[PDB]
Ligand binder design. Structure first.
Ligand SMILES: NC(=O)C1=CN([C@@H]2O[C@H](COP(=O)(O)OP(=O)(O)OC[C@H]3O[C@@H](n4cnc5c(N)ncnc54)[C@H](OP(=O)(O)O)[C@@H]3O)[C@@H](O)[C@H]2O)C=CC1
Ligand SMILES: Nc1nc(=O)c2c([nH]1)NCC(CNc1ccc(C(=O)N[C@@H](CCC(=O)O)C(=O)O)cc1)=N2
Length: 157
């Protein structure tokens, strides 16, 4: 099973200077819930940004670098590799992999961050004419989660 997992803002920003522009503990909790016990596939820059494998799931990194051999991580070197991974596979970023995979995934789990941040990396444009809203759930605001956000589960029409 092949899903996108992403948070993007109102203008589809996903990154700035190899980090997330927002802090939203809840959405990382959201990622944890969705991905724990399964597989994350991510590009090299994204891994480097995370810097360590994410506990309690398969972390797969797509890189051209044949020297890449990290501890806790399985490496792949082409997109085709993804299609041989077993189980529920979340495409986890970044811009490059999203652009490569958006037309290939069954569904997307998108957190819409309801703000406008400065960014240098972007989720590709997509139309609700192509995607059907299996669910939409407003995230809860509180002292530690202060930007409004919506969890979308979208399914290709
Ligand atoms: N908001 C969100 O949901 C998330 C945000 N992000 C953000 O996105 C940004 C990173 O995105 P981006 O800069 O595009 O980088 P990526 O995370 O997509 O990593 C880019 C690298 O991935 C490798 N790669 C990608 N495609 C291939 C391929 N087809 N074959 C072999 N290797 C490949 C390459 O590594 P190499 O050069 O070693 O070959 C490439 O340079 C960061 O700011 C990060 O914070 C990332 C994920 C999620
Ligand atoms: N929807 C979504 N939101 C994101 O913030 C996100 C995304 N998708 N895809 C990839 C990605 C890459 N960045 C990061 C950064 C930190 C963690 C992380 O530490 N997650 C922990 C939970 C931490 C917590 O409980 O606060 C984990 O166990 O997954 C994950 C991804 N970030």
């Amino acid at each position: 099973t092949l899903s996108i997992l992403v948070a993007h803002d109102l203008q589809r920003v996903i990154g700035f200077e190899n980090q997330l522009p927002w802090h939203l503990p809840n959405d990382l909790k959201h990622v944890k819930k969705l991905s724990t016990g399964h597989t994350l596939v991510m590009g090299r820059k994204t891994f480097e940004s995370i810097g360590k494998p994410l506990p309690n799931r398969r972390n797969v990194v797509l890189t051209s670098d044949t020297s890449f051999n990290v501890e806790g991580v399985d490496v792949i070197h082409s997109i085709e590799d993804i299609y041989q991974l077993p189980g529920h596979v979340f495409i986890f970023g970044g811009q490059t992999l999203f652009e490569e995979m958006i037309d290939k995934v069954d569904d997307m789990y998108i957190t819409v961050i309801e703000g406008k941040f400065r960014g240098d990396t972007f989720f590709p444009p997509y139309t609700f004419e192509d995607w059907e809203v299996a669910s939409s759930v407003e995230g809860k605001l509180d002292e530690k989660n202060t930007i409004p956000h919506t969890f979308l589960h979208l399914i290709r029409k």
